Symmetry: C2
Subunit: 200 residues, 2 copies
């Protein structure tokens, strides 16, 4: 199963996540987040990573002119629009980078989202980065569309069997592997990736 | 273990490699190569892929400005320099994209290659694209340096043990999983990833 570790703020965490087998790493550049990091910093960390890990930039309600300039600034490869950006904007950025669109789940997901112009659709719980989970089924309607779906929302090594069952494109983790918001736990990560291979 | 499937020329091959768990896909843009693909085609195939797979451009003795133009046209994320590119060129391309530098092995690897300015050093056979293998121990001297090394040169699901034992950063495959140059074999691709999971 593909795993993305979001909210990276330290070299230490990026390297461990990479070593454990993460396919992608998230770098939050949305002013006002509990996991925000300076673009220049995210780039420094990127100079330290290997070429086979995707660098994702996370934004929120920022004009394409902004995002594209930030993406370049931090030398990122994929843009995650976590605000409520217009498909027009997603399209403008999607013209330079693959785009992942975030969508809150206050219940069932409107299959019409599979219509949003993004290479991946992320199903996150009520609040963004609030470690709040939700019932596994709430993803059915979107997964049904066949679009690549990334499951997030309080995922952790404990309740993997659930999300893993749905067999989505990838899993996105943050709180589930942190000792604190923005700080990762070597142990948590270790077990997580230990569980996965175990559930081969 | 991280795996890159190089020489992609068809969407079906890119999709299968992605589905099987490849971390990266190679798109050859070097004139004279048997697995060369049109940059507009690499872009099109790119639009069909998920965001968590790295798109690599492969070049040979092409100047920075050409490399950068191609990377942009094909919308690729990492540049693989497979010729005799001097460090100056690697640094120039590296201002914008992570860089992988290939070294054709004709004997034990030079530890001083660790000084070349690239995020990863790829060890290929005496004749790139030939599918010819080489004594794996030859990788020791460079692996010893601690830098990220990617092993290539006629790797196939049949000889995974030896290179897997070297614990490099990643493995690069092409001929080992093809029915013909540029045309991947579904059977071989599945065999490879099954053999890997079985040797975890």
């Amino acid at each position: 199963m593909r795993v993305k570790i979001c909210g990276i703020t330290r070299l230490e965490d990026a390297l461990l996540a990479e070593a454990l087998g993460a396919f992608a790493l998230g770098f939050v550049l949305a002013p006002g987040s509990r996991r925000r990091i300076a673009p220049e910093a995210a780039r420094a960390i990127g100079e330290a990573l290997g070429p086979f890990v995707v660098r994702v930039g996370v934004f929120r309600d920022q004009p394409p002119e902004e995002v594209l300039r930030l993406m370049e600034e931090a030398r990122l490869q994929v843009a995650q629009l976590h605000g409520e950006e217009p498909p027009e904007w997603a399209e403008a950025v999607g013209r330079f980078y693959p785009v992942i669109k975030a969508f809150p789940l206050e219940g069932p997901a409107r299959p019409e989202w599979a219509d949003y112009p993004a290479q991946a659709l992320l199903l996150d719980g009520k609040r963004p980065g609030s470690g709040e989970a939700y019932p596994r089924a709430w993803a059915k309607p979107l997964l049904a569309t066949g679009r690549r779906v990334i499951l997030a929302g309080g995922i952790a090594p404990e309740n993997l069997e659930e999300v893993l069952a749905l067999r989505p494109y990838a899993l996105d983790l943050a709180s589930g592997v942190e000792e604190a918001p923005g700080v990762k736990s070597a142990e948590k990560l270790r077990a997580l990736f230990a569980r996965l291979a175990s559930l081969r």
